[PDB]
From a paper:
Senescence marker protein-30 ([name]) is a 34-kDa protein whose tissue levels in the liver, kidney, and lung decrease with aging. Biochemical studies suggested that [name] is a [name] ([name], EC 3.1.1.17) and requires a divalent metal ion such as Zn2+ and Mn2+ for its [name] activity. In the ascorbic acid biosynthesis pathway, the ring structure of d-glucuronate is cleaved to generate l-gulonate, and then a γ-lactone ring, which is a basic structural framework of ascorbic acid, is formed from l-gulonate by [name]/[name].
In the course of the crystallographic refinement, a strong electron density was found inside the β-propeller structure in both mouse and human [name]/[name]. The ICP-MS analysis suggested that the divalent metal ion bound to [name]/[name] molecules in the crystal showed heterogeneity; the [name]/[name] molecules bound Mn2+, Zn2+, Mg2+, or Ca2+ in the crystal. Since Ca2+ was the most abundant metal ion in the purified sample, a Ca2+ ion was placed at the metal site for the crystallographic refinement. The asymmetric unit of the mouse and human [name]/[name] contained two [name]/[name] molecules. However, molecular weight analysis with static light scattering revealed that mouse and human [name]/[name] exist as a monomer in solution. Least-squares fitting of mouse and human [name]/[name] with corresponding 297 Cα atoms gave a root-mean-square (rms) deviation of approximately 0.6 Å. Since human cells have a loss-of-function genetic mutation on gluconolactone oxidase, which is the last enzyme in the ascorbic acid biosynthesis pathway, human cells cannot synthesize ascorbic acid. Therefore, human [name]/[name], the crystal structure of which was determined earlier, may have a biological function other than ascorbic acid biosynthesis.
Numbering used by the authors: 3 to 299
Write the structure that this text describes.
């Protein structure tokens, strides 16, 4: 049954993009406004951090070595051993204050990531300034659609025929038909509408039974969704309100890791939630997730 542990009380300003790296038994994650990519060794319990030159919104495995990440509005290759970033491509060059937000590699090794206008005062942002992109293995960029408010959680169905996507200010999880061979998406439709208490949908991952787990920012929970029926199958409440994202990890992807944010917490909120910004592990969910895909460029 379910057991929750703050495995690393990291106090992240905005912990995000959890990715399990099974070859090192470590969790990768970012702290967006601190400009850090982080690696927590689940055995030694120690964490490495590398600091970039702009906010870093997501990180992913790169098959040929090291990592890729979204830094500002740039797709970058990250040499972990040299702590250096090399720009692979740039987007939104016409925007005053945009950044990438959530991103993830697709089943063919393409790095999907979308953008947003940056906050200019806690929860104040310019509307519809973002777009969803993907970085292909030869480094060219495809733009799928614009008018995005806050590009957020995303994953693919296990048969690799459906792409799931969250624009947070739609309070909806959407699905697209997805073509593995071309990376094309189409036929956008809502598969789940969040309830008031579920607040803002943030990050998302799929499980090995094809169900989606969505982190609810300000909702202090992850919710499990059936995209076929639109039914919420389960709610798992966490001891912190600002739950931001989730992934599966640990042995055979049997554990869930949940990131969260300390930014925007009043000091009274911090006394009630001293572990705000920490990394939480949930065991006993009774379902496994799947391995992350690795970027092919
Ligand atoms: Ca997010």
């Amino acid at each position: 049954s379910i057991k929750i542990e703050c495995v690393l009380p990291e106090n992240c300003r905005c912990g995000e993009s959890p990715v399990w790296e099974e070859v090192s038994n470590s969790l990768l994650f970012v702290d967006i406004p601190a400009k850090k990519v982080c690696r927590w060794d689940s055995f030694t319990k120690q964490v490495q951090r590398v600091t970039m030159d702009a906010p870093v919104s997501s990180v992913a495995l790169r098959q040929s070595g090291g990592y890729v990440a979204t830094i500002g509005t740039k797709f970058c290759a990250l040499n972990w051993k040299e702590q250096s970033a090399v720009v692979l491509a740039t987007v939104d060059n016409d925007k005053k204050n945009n950044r990438f937000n959530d991103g993830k590699v697709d089943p063919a090794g393409r790095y999907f990531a979308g953008t947003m206008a940056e906050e200019t005062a806690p929860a104040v942002l310019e509307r519809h300034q973002g777009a969803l992109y993907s970085l292909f293995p030869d480094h060219h960029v495809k733009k799928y659609f614009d008018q995005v408010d806050i590009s957020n959680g995303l994953d693919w169905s296990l048969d690799h025929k459906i792409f799931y996507y969250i624009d947070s200010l739609s309070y909806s999880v959407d699905a697209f038909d997805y073509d593995l061979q071309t990376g094309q998406i189409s036929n956008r439709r809502s598969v789940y509408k969040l309830e008031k208490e579920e607040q803002i949908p943030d990050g998302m991952c799929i499980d090995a039974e094809g169900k989606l787990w969505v982190a609810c920012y300000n909702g202090g929970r992850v919710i499990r969704l059936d995209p076929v029926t639109g039914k919420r199958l389960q709610t798992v409440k966490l001891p912190v309100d600002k739950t931001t994202s989730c992934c599966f990890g640990g042995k055979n992807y049997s554990e869930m890791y949940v990131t969260c944010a300390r930014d925007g917490m009043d000091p009274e909120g911090l006394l009630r939630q001293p572990e705000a910004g920490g990394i939480f592990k949930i065991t006993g969910l009774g379902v496994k997730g799947i391995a992350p895909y690795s970027y092919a460029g």
